Design a protein around this ligand. Structure first.
Ligand SMILES: [Cl-]
Ligand SMILES: [Cl-]
Ligand SMILES: [Gd]
Ligand SMILES: [Gd]
Ligand SMILES: [Gd]
Ligand SMILES: [Gd]
Ligand SMILES: [Gd]
Ligand SMILES: [Gd]
Ligand SMILES: [Gd]
Ligand SMILES: [Gd]
Ligand SMILES: [Gd]
Ligand SMILES: [Gd]
Ligand SMILES: [Gd]
Ligand SMILES: [Gd]
Length: 258
């Protein structure tokens, strides 16, 4: 057969070929999220798009280093230092620092999240951009843990529409990784989602992450078709393009036959 037959039942993930100037990294938008709100981010509609109905706090572009690792301060005898959550103990201290005099349960302001000055204790952020696979095959995205609630979505019309990265979020809840905080309790670690991608096509990628209290954590990785893993620093894999809603040919519904 002269040509490949195509993925069965239109099963290929939609990708894009934006024609404009590529820029390294993802866009990060920040939205208000209330301290100690442990219920809003438990809803799929909120995590897919509703987050954008709350106040937009700001944004930062061009981010390649995308894992989240936010530690609250311990106000200690020797000064004020971030405490790794596994080093917190009692009511409360931080190993190596003694007892901390400050509350774990108030908002704290920091530039930890991508340099943007906000409250990582209580915030929702949206990362958007396009993933560029260097190799054709199965990619397995993962979150090592989720503190507090997160989704990851890959593909045109799942993450966002091709050539329309800057538009309001779309309503798809077909998450690649569903790390939404359960109403009852929470999820295992090493939560994962696989996508088959064709080299050289740009795959829309959206991550939505929220925290309600104190520590925030979202270690992001992808395993490539060759079995290697890229963790935290996605330089060379993630890009942004300015919207071009006029670019007629931008959407590739089936890269398996394009
Ligand atoms: Cl600190
Ligand atoms: Cl100690
Ligand atoms: Gd990092
Ligand atoms: Gd870094
Ligand atoms: Gd960090
Ligand atoms: Gd950590
Ligand atoms: Gd940081
Ligand atoms: Gd840091
Ligand atoms: Gd960092
Ligand atoms: Gd679409
Ligand atoms: Gd948290
Ligand atoms: Gd493997
Ligand atoms: Gd780092
Ligand atoms: Gd723009």
């Amino acid at each position: 057969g002269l040509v490949p037959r195509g993925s069965h039942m239109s099963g290929a993930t939609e990708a894009c070929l934006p024609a404009g100037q590529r820029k390294s990294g993802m866009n990060i938008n920040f939205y208000q999220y209330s301290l100690k709100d442990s219920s809003t981010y438990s809803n799929a509609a909120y995590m897919a798009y509703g987050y954008a109905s709350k106040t937009k706090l700001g944004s930062v572009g061009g981010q390649t280093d995308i894992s989240i690792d936010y530690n609250i301060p311990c106000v200690s005898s020797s000064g004020t230092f971030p405490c790794p959550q596994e080093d917190s103990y009692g009511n409360w201290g931080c190993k190596g620092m003694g007892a901390c005099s400050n509350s774990q349960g108030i908002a704290y302001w920091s530039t930890d999240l991508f340099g943007f000055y906000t409250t990582p204790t209580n915030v929702t952020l949206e990362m958007t951009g396009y993933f560029l696979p260097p190799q054709t095959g199965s990619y397995t995205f993962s979150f090592a843990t989720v503190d507090d609630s997160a989704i990851l979505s890959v593909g045109g019309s799942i993450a966002f529409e091709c050539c329309a990265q800057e538009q309001p979020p779309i309503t798809s809840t077909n998450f690649t990784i569903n790390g939404i905080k359960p109403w009852d309790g929470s999820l295992p670690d090493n939560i994962t989602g696989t996508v088959y991608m064709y080299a050289g096509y740009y795959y829309p990628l959206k991550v939505v992450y929220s925290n309600a209290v104190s520590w925030g954590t979202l270690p992001i990785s992808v395993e490539l078709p060759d079995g290697t893993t890229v963790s935290d620093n996605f330089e060379g894999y993630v890009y942004s393009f300015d919207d071009d809603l006029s670019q007629s040919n931008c959407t590739i519904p089936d890269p398996s036959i394009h």
